[PDB]
Every structure is written in C-alpha cells, then in structure tokens.
Design a protein around this nucleic acid. Sequence first.
DNA 1: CATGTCAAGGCCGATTATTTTTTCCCCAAAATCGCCGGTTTAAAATTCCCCAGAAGG
DNA 2: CCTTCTGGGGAATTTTAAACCGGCGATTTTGGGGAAAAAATAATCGGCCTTGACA
DNA 3: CATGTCAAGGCCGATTATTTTTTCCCCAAAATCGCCGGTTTAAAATTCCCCAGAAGG
DNA 4: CCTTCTGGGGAATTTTAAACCGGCGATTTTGGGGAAAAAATAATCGGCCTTGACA
Lengths: 358, 362, 358, 362
Amino acid sequence: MITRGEFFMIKEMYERGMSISDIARELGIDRKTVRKYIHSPNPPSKSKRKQRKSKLDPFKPYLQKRMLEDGVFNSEKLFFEIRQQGYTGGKTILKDYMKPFRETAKKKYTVRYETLPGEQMQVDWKEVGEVVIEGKKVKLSLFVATLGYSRMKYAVFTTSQDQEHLMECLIQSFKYFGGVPKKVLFDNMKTVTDGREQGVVKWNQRFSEFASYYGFIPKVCRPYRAQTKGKVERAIQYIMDHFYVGTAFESIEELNFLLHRWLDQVANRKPNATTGISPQERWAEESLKPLPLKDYDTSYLSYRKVHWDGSFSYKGEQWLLSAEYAGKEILVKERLNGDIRLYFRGEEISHVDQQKKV
Amino acid sequence: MITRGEFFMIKEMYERGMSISDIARELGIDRKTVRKYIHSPNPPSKSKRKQRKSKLDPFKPYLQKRMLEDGVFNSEKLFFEIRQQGYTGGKTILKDYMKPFRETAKKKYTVRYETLPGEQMQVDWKEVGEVVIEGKKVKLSLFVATLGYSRMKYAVFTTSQDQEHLMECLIQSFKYFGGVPKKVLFDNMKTVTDGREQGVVKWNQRFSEFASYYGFIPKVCRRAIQYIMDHFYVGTAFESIEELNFLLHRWLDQVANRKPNATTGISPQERWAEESLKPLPLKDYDTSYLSYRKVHWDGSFSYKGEQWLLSAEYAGKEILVKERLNGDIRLYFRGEEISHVDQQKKVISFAEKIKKKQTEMA
Amino acid sequence: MITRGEFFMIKEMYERGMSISDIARELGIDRKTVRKYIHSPNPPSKSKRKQRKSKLDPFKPYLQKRMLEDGVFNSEKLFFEIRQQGYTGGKTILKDYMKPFRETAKKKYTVRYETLPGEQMQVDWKEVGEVVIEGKKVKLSLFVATLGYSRMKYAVFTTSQDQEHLMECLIQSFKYFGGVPKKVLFDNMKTVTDGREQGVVKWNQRFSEFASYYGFIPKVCRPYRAQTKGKVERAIQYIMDHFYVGTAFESIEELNFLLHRWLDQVANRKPNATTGISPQERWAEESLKPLPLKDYDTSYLSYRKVHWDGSFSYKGEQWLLSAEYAGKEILVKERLNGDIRLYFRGEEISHVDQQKKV
Amino acid sequence: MITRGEFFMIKEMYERGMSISDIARELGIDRKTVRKYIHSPNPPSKSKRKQRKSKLDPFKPYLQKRMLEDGVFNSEKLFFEIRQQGYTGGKTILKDYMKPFRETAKKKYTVRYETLPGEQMQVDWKEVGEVVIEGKKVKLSLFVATLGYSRMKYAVFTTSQDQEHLMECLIQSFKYFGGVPKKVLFDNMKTVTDGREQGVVKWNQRFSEFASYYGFIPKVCRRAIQYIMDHFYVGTAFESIEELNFLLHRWLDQVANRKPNATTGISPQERWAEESLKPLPLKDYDTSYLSYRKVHWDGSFSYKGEQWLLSAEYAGKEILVKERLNGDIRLYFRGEEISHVDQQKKVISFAEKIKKKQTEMA
DNA sequence: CATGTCAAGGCCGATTATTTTTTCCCCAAAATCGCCGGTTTAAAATTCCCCAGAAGG
DNA sequence: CCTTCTGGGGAATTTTAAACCGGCGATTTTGGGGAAAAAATAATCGGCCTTGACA
DNA sequence: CATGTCAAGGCCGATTATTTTTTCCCCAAAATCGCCGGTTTAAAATTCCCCAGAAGG
DNA sequence: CCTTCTGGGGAATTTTAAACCGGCGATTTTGGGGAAAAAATAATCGGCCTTGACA
Ligand SMILES: [Mg+2]
Ligand SMILES: [Mg+2]
C-alpha cells in the first residue's frame, strides 16, 4: 500500500494530464494501482480491520470471572488453570489480554458532591508514625479538619487520640474557623460511635452531649466506606506530602506552630483546583456561631479520708472541705502539671480551701 | 549536387527529340547523369546521408551514463577519463555533444514559468505583532492566500497558526474565491508535513484527508504579507478581532483586489473572473480540535482547564472531544456521540458543576 | 545541518566527479557547506554539546542535601525553600532536575551471597490477613522455610504464631526436607530471641534447648535488617502472588493440603532463575540427619486436690496417682481435643490410672 | 546558391583582364553578383539563416513547462490545450518538437548502462534453509557480495542477518577483494535504512558511520545466490559452520571466481586484477553488538541470559556492553571501560557467579 | 563469620495464517506517434535601374 | 572636355530551406479479468530484562 | 438525606540566550565553454569503359 | 546482315557535408574571508491532565 506522498503525487500527475503508463513508470507503481488511486477520494490510511477469533476466545469468560470476581491477575496462574481446560496456546496472549484488566482493577465509579456553606466539617485522624522527642518515643498523630465549602484546612499534632484530645482539637478547629458547622463528618471510631445497630448510626452519650453543648450534629458516613470523607483524607495527603516530609522539629509546640504558619502561608490561600478560589476568601461565606469552652480533665488517682473536722492531708498540705464531706472518703486527682481536683462519688468538689500549714 | 532546373530541362529536351549522347556532348555532362536524372520522379532534395560516423561513438554510452546518472558535465574530467579509455579525438567534440544535455540540466534551475489559471495557491503566514484581548497578550498572526494566476490576496487574522486554524482559513479562502485550486503550496511547517528529506515529503493524516475532501493537493516547497502590513495594519484603529477581519476584507474588496498592476494594467477581479476553480463540496469539513481525553473514574475529565462531569456509563474510558472553533464541544465515545453537556461560554469552577450534576441527577 | 542522506549524496557526487556548484544547485545546498562535507570523514550527527550553567546550579548542593539526607522530593516545597535563598527561576527546572533523584531514591547497594549445601535454612512468618472459616474470623499466618542451597520452598498456614506452633512448623519443614541444616536463619522476634545485649545476638533458653535437641543453631541476622533473609521473603511473595490470590478454601487442613500440592507441582520443581536448576533435583545434595519428634502441648487450667487414697475426681471420672501425690494439689490440663495431662509443681505426672467408675 | 568554382573562376577571369560587364554578358549572370563574389574572402558555405520563426513559438514556454514539470508528453491533450489557447497549427509540429524531450524522458527508464571498475558492489541475502547446531535449529543465511565490473562473488554463511553480521561480512568482503568500492548497494532492509519514500532514503547511524569509516556509500535501490546454492550447497557434506565457510571459500577460489564466462571468455580473476578499489583503513571497525543495560542495585545485570555481577562503583547505572562476534564482552560505563569480568564460554548459573564474587572479594 | 532475592510482567521479535492489495500475462481494441512526401512561408540572394568617380577618345 | 563604364544602393522577385499539414503504418497504451505474490495487520509463542514487594 | 477529592508530577509547548553552522557578497584569479573558421574524413554522386538489345543503313 | 548507339553496371575520384581541432573571448566556478541569518541544542517558565494515596 503506497503512502500519502505517492497518492498525492498520482493525483497531481493525473490533474496535470499525464498518461497512466508514464505515472506508473515514474513512480515505480503498477498501472492498475495508479488507476485505482485516480478515482479514490479516500487516501491511503492504516485502515484497521476487525479483530478475528483467537485461541483464547472460548476461555475469555472464565478469565473475566477470575479477574473481576475472584480477583486474579497473575498470568501464569490463569495459564495453568486454563491449560487443564483445553487451552493450546502460549502466555503472551494471556498477558496482553489481561493487561487492560490489571491496569483498570480496584477502580469503581464515584459520585462527586459539594455541600452547602457551614454544613459539613470533615474531621479525621492519622497515626503519622514514631518520632523521638527529648530522647523519648511518641506515637504522633495528625488531626485534620476541613470545612466542606471553603476547604479551610486546619491541622494539629497530638500525642494521643483520646476522647478529651479529640474534643480539644475539635474546639481548637472551631475557634480557628470562628463557628461550629451544623454537621460534622467523622469516621467509624469508638469515641465518635459506641457501635452499630443493624446499619443504624450510633453515637456516644458523652460526644452527643458535647455536640449539643456546641450545637453541631455528627454525620458519620457508611461503615467501612472511608472514601466518603475525601476532603479531609486528601488534606491529610497534602500535609504529609508537603510539610512533614522534610520537617525538622524538637518540641511538639514548635511543630504545631510550624504547621499553623505553613497553613496560613500556603495551605489556606493556595487556589484550590476544583473550586479555583483561595480557601481564605471563601472562609467568610460560612455561617458561624461560637460558644465558650469546657473540658473534663480528670485522672483516676489516689483517695484520702476526710477527718471529722473537714480537713485532709495531701502531700503534706492541709485541705478543708464543706462539713458535708466530714468523715467520708474522697478522690484526689493530681495531674503532672500540678492541677489538683477533688471528687466525691464521681462528682467534682467545687469548694476547697488550701491551708498552707506546712 | 547540380541544379534541379537543369535536370528538368534535360528531361524535357530528351522528351523533345534530342539524342542522349548529343545532350551529353552539348552540356559537358555525361550521358548517364542525364539518364539518371531523366527518370527522376521528384526533384533531388537534400541528400540522404545516414548517421555519419563520429570519433567518439564507442564512448557515447559512457558519456550518456556520466551525464544522466553521475551528473558530470565538464569536458575536462571526462576528456581525461576517455583519454584513459582510448580516446583519439579532442575537446570541441565533447563540448558540442554535451551542450544539449548541459542546457537541459541547467533548465532544471531556471524556473521562470508562469502559473496558469487555477493551478496553484500560494499561502503565507505572519506574526503580526503583540495585541491584548480581554487583558491577555496574544501573538496574532496574519494568513494570506494568493492565487497564482489572478494574483488576488485573501488575508485574515488568526490567534494561532495551528492545523485547525489553517483548515478553517483554507475553507474561508475557497469560499471567498468561489471554488478550489488544483494544488495549494505552503512554507515548510509542522501542521502540514512531518519533515522532509530534500525531495520527498511526509504528509500529515488529517491534512491529507482535508485536502482530498476539498480536492486539492498540498505542496511544501523550499512579500504580499509585508505589503498588507505596510498599507493596512499600520495606523489602523480596532478593538475587536472580528471587526479587524471585517475591515481587512472590506479593504481587500475595495482597493487591494481591485488595484490594477502597472505592467499588466488589469485589476485582479477580471483575472479571477477568467479563472478555473473546481467546485466546492456541498458540506464543509469538521475542523474541530480532535483531542482524546481519559475520563477519570469519577467522571471528571479536563479540557483546556475546564473539568466536565459525565455519567457512569462512560467513566474510565477515553473519549474524543471535538471542539468547534466557535466554542461548542462535542464528545464522542467509540463513535457513539454522547449528550452535549452544558457549554455556557463562561469558565466556571468545578464545584459549580458538581452541584449542577448533583441536583440534576436527583 | 544536513542529514545523512545529503552527506552520502554529496560524497557520491564528488566521487562521481561533479563540480561543487552543480552539487550545490541540485541538492539545494550552499557551495561552502558542500566543500565542508567533501573532506569530512565524520558524517552529520546529533553532536551533543556540553551542558552549560543554569539558574539552579548554585542551589544544587542544597537540593541534593534535601533529597538524600532529609529525604525531600516534593517539587514545590523545595521551590519555596530555595525561592527565599535568591532563586529567580521556575518549577519545571526543579522537577526535571529532581526526577532522576526521586526515581533512584531509597535504593542502596546490596551484596549477593549463596551459602553451602545444608548450612542455611531461612524461616519467616507472615500475617496474611483476616479470613472467615465456618463463620468465625481467624488471623491466618503463612510460615515459610527455604533451604538456601536448593531453594526448596515449604509453606504452612497456621492460626497462631506461638512458640509451640513455630516449633511444630519447623519440625514439619525439617521432616519435609529430610534433615536439619546446621544453621537456621530467623528474624528478630520474641520467641527466637529474648532481646538484645549491646548488639549481641541472644536466644531464648527454650528455643536453644529445642535446637540442641534437633541439632541446629539459630543465626538471626542484623536487627532491623530484614533484607538479609531475601530467600524466604521472596518465597513469601511467590506464594502470595501465585497461590493465595484466587484460592478458594473452607477448612484449614484443606488449604494446607492445597498449598503442599501446589508446592510439589510448581513451587519446588520450577527452574529457579538465579540457579537455573529445579529445586527438587538439588534437594538431594544437602546433608541430612533427622531425629524423633517432641512437643510441649500444655495449657494452664484448673486444679484438683488429691485425696489421701490417691484418687481425685475430674468431670465425674476417677483418677488414681502414686501415693507420693496423696493429700497434695495437682494441675489438670485438658485441651479442647480431650487430651488430659496431670502436673505437680510444674512437673508432668507420667503415671495415671483412669478408673471409669461413672 | 551557385557553384563556388564558378565564383572562383569569375574572380580569376576578372583578375585575368576581362571587363566585368563582358563577364556578365558572357555568363548570363549580372555584373553585380560577379562583383559581390569577386571580393569573397572564403567560399560561400551554408547560408546563415537566423532562427526561422515557427507557428508555435509563443507556446514553446508553455509546452516546455508541461513537459518538464507537468510531465505530459501526449500530442493530443496539449494539442487541445493550445487550441484553446489560440493555436493555429497542427499536430506534426508538436510531435516532432516533443520527440527529443520524449526520448530523453524515456531514457530515464532504459537503464542498460555498464558498471565500471570499482563503482558498485551488489549485495544479496538468503535463507539457506534449516540446520541444527549443538542440537538447536537455526535459520542460517547466505551473504553474497558481487563486484559490478569483475563479477566475482564472495559468499559466506551467517546465522543472523543483523547489522553487526552485515558489517563483519562487508569487512571480510573488502579484505577478500583487496580494497573497497565507491558505492555498495543492498536490498531494502531494516539494518540499512529506516524506511524509504519513493526517491529518498533515511540511512542508519551506525551503518553510516561504518560506511564513512570504510569509505563507501550505501544504496538501497528498489540469482547469484540461487546459482551458488544449486552448484555448491546441494549434495554437500559438513558438520561445522566454519568448515562449511572454508569449503565455500575454497570452491569460490577454485571454480567460481576462475570460471570463464561463455560470452566474454575471460575469468573473473583478470577482471578483478584490472579493477580499482580504494585502500582499506589500517584498523578495523568495532562491530560489537552495542547494547545498553541497566545494572540492578545488587550489581546483577543480564545480557542474553547471562547475569554478570559488578562492583558497587557502577551499581544502578546503565552501561554499554559491546559484544565482539567472537564472544568477548567489554563493558563501558560513560566511556570509562571497566575491568573485563570473567568471560568463560560456558553458560554458568548465577549462583556460581555469586560464589565466585563472594570468595574473590574476601 | 555476616552478606537481599526471586518471579512476574511487559516488550520485542519472530513465525504462521488469513485477508487485502498489488502486480503480471494474454487477447482484443483503440489511440498516438513517427517518417516521408508535398506544400507553404519566411528569409536570403540576385538582378535591374539611376548617381558618382575615373579613364580614355 | 566630354562621354562611357563601373560601383554601390535599394527594391522586388525568385529560389531554397525549413516548417507545416495530412495520411498510413506501426507501436504503444488502457481497460478488464484471472492468478500469483507480496505486504499489512492481527494473532500467537517464547525468551529476556528490569523492577517491585515483603521484608 | 448519603454521595471521593485534591495536589503533585510529568510532559509538552513556547520563549529566550548562546553557540555553531550555513549562506551571501565582493574582489581577485583561474578554468572552461562556445562560436567561428579551417581542415579532414566518410559518404555519396558522377563519369568512364565494356556487353547487350534494338533500330536503321 | 551488319553496324552503331544506348542502357546498365562497376570502380574510382571528386565534391560536399559533417565532423574535428585549435585559439580567442567570455563566462562561470572555486577558494577564502567577513558578516548576517537560521538552525539546533540546552535551558527556563507556566499550564494542563492524569494518576495515586489516605483512606
Ligand atoms: Mg518478616
Ligand atoms: Mg482515616
């Protein structure tokens, strides 16, 4: 099959009026081919034909069943399996036929969705790994909060993912935004959800009362479907692939301060690809309504019996309580920072006098 | 030879009643020349001399080989070579014998032929300069087609010199001139040929399809632009590209294609009127930008910064996004055209399209 | 610069004896270029020149320090970092310069080694994942043993990686091979090693006495360097990428039997790439010396006080012991399979009479 | 014209003492023709007639354009065209005027020229059949070079028709013939040109370097093999390829290159003796298979099934593994040659090389 | 002594089978080209009258 | 002193050569059908090289 | 209501700067080609003697 | 009856035409140097599209 140059030359020659024989002689082409290409508006082209039958055709349904349902993409395993079924072919066929399927595996169809301003705050955790601070190992964890409409990323590094730490980071994110969105999206975790009841979302009483105090509602997604919170997950693959990779830190406060400056610099004002607008100039389009702060900092610790005069001794210091506690046993809760609380039957004692009779 | 009139007179005198021998004695010519020319059926014209043998006939095949394949026309190199091969002649013979072939070879370079009606259309490009459209700089380009015979010029401003703009401007030129010419010749450029090797050219696929659809043949082989720029663009007021093209076409119709040449004294209009352009097809070629685009598994496929969302039926596949020069986008999936999605000519954020599809589906 | 075709044509024409001017006219090339190419044994070529200076050159040492020591390969992070240092360039330079480094990162140089016959048996574990058998979840684990010289892979699926299970699988592999190699290579695990002592390999007393009983020596590799046992690790990436992917099983014995048949079919006789010889025809070139089998199947369970007559009751059945145990408390060890043992002060009682007085 | 002898006699008679008027009266020729031819310095030869005007001179440029660019030589198409353009003549004029150009164009196809000494070497390939070497089948191929002038044939058996075998066999042919010819012409094949487009050819890089190192030029343009196979290979006993090549060269030296042609009556040996081959360079080209190979980070890089181990200095890089046809392997890393690793011609397992390096390093 | 290894997938090349395209051969019909002879046109040559110079009555 | 002859120039006609036109014979070209060969595309089989994954 | 998303890397194209190659113009020198005239060679034509046929003394 | 003239054939020489050789004049070609333009390679900057990763 001659190429486009020869066809254009032939058309030129005939339009010039030359004899077919002279065209054939000069172009080194037969006269009949010249004739064919005279009256042919279609120039030479690859002209792909229809795929014909193949040795693998009768086995293709089984190959598809193995590939999709079972999930097999090893060329030789399927070759061995179908050799027992009468396959009289080689392995390159199987590799070539399977290449598209293995290239397009574990990929479903997904529905893109955007929510309304101030009505979806995605929140997620991440165990970054193991780091050494002051010679002591710690399992550091990112906590990330992304506002759905504005994509206003906020992140904080913590040492534990306890309920108290979760609530503290959530409040920090809220005051960072300036308001509490009505719906907060989370993942299936013990703190957020006690469990499941026949596919019914369940939330812990503590978290429910916390949210009622702060006027938001959890909206945990489908179990085992963590793709739902794509915003926060990709905000976590941005922090990790832009900030942590190459970060030098010595103190946790230093790292958090580095992260917040990095956020305000590039993470909160870089024009988002999908929205095309900087997050900071859409962070003011979300309804806000803040509230004061509260916490439940407590640790189950030693007890002390209160004398009949209302005085009890702790670490050599004298503490006086109301006469109602005289003769009863109380729980003294001292944290590593020196904060001291007193409890009785699980209720915090709000009135305490510290008489420094050392 | 001898006078023909003498031969005819001798024949008549023999037929007059005079003995041949007496004729020979009187005329001082033998009786047998008289006898030979008496039976002459026709007058003795130029003697038939048969291929007088020369002094280089044996080497004629060698010299022809040299000239026609080796290409050597000097009369000294080959003179020495034939001397080595046993040549007993001189130089004038070789010079005279090669002179026809020498002039034939020279004529290959004296290309001073005239283009005949409808034969070829010469096309030229140009960077007009730098202009600002909607606050963005752009290197606008002039595109000038020129009929070889009528000399008329069709000029237009286009942002890009890409293949699609080339095809659209060729269509416009054919419409303006009322038909198509046999051959269309350009300057060596990527949109036409994918390189050349000094005598042969590798034509493009889409360009060749276009050319054979409009019945012309491309030709990239090895001023009007500068005149247009010096006489129209300089000192011209315009704020729109469409208005500028309108003004250029008006100027062309008034005082460019109707400007008589000093030598010929005829305006281009009459020359075009006496021109032969083959008809133009009933419909026009689809010069829409042809671009294959993979559609992500979420349906979001991006084209020139605009991310369109499709349905799950065609997610994960590659589709041909034909973009018409006007701005309309047509998506074809394995030949089966898909519903024309919203094509409002206002670049909008992808989240807006997410919302649009989310509300439309439900 | 003309191409090879033009240069060859020019050489042809001059060898033919043509004038320089005629060559120039016919080829459409200037006479001086023709002259240059007449006497030039070097034909036209790409002729790559030397790379010149670049805006990024003064910053390249810092980029290399970030890439290798810190380990940063994000284009924009380094762009931002070096923009503050006076970089007046774009980002494509940085991406292009960094592409080779990111393509060749986390790759050291490694020394290939082969050991002598019957002197290295690599052994490793793997937690395959979570599977459901009879409606009950189980954390299945591969145990793989590869003989260094023969590459004679053996594998067994287990439900736990306890010390007893480890020893049982090791013995099964040994009897599969027919002999105990002198050196057995393991990984840093609690069962194999109690701990570390200033970079000194330490082994548990139980495992040490076990190996002495079976006449082999542990040869645990460098800590944190699990690359040392490449043979077993790739034997584990062969089982997973050839057998488990697409395996249907309902009972653990069925799965182990499937695996052993698959081994004997393709895993033990497929010609190894490096050695070029089937493992089965080099499995007979390794020294062997087996020994009988032993185990420590015990479970800490309930106790029973022995009466003064030597009889004690368990689950309604009467058991008689030697008079030495009269009046003492013993430990009855009953497994789920009904195996019953008796212990006293940690020592198993070997003499017991079961009087079925039900 | 009139007789020159008459003019000379008249001049002498006037110089003899006879009045011009009396001469005119006697000869029946005017006195003034006599006067004109009396002062003749040289005899009156062919009259100088100046470019007799024809009936198609205005159209001569058009006809030349048609013939030399359009290529149309028919005397009917152009006859009608010139009739349209106002042609008042006939057909014989056009036929005769084109006959020179027609025969010149025809001569482009009557390629019946003789190859002169040393000019071109015609090379041909062949699949000899199927043979078994060391228990493995192989499609051996014959390679036959042929001098255009001397007609001698150099034939050799090679397993592969790859480029390196081609270069080695060309070197052997040049050594056998004692020099190199100007041009070497092959059949269209991948090892020489990367495709052609009917008039132009894209030569290879290594092949061109080789050709310009041995001072010849390739030429792929558009029997001896079959004779060799029918007269030597049929009914031949051999168990080695080297022995077969030795026997073929012996046969060529005895009764193939010394077999007189019936027509010429001369053996090829004398024709070669009277041949001009340009000298051969002092050294030979390196036709070692050029293959770039990435070296894994463990130093194990594989070539044709053999996995060699290198040192950490060159681990992770790509090296050029030049394989000489003999079997030796030379590794070059960015120009700096590396120590020639063990190259025993016995394919050995990779574990053996692991052991070798492990014991050598320590 | 401590030392990383093995396999799978993809790509390239070669071989075989089917389909499409190109090339070659024979018979019949048509068209064009070349050579020779005759005629026509253009160019060249020759001859016929007046002015000037030289020679002879 | 004068007359005649000769030489040169101009115009017209004739002759010769070249070119042009028509007819005949030979050769070449074009169209259609059949068979064989070559080229292009798709399918099939085996081997080699490099990279990746569990660590 | 429940619905996956965002960024980074690589590639392509365009623009700018530096280096290499190619092309063009002017002056001086050298070589080759073409035309005209003269000479030589080959081919063609013509003329000069013997045999045959026809006509006239 | 016979003699003379005419026609045809063969050979040699001469004439004409074509071709060949040498010299002169004109034109074309080649080599070197300088300047300008174009092409190729390397470097630089911005944008777009697709894929991958934490889930
Ligand atoms: Mg492990
Ligand atoms: Mg998560």
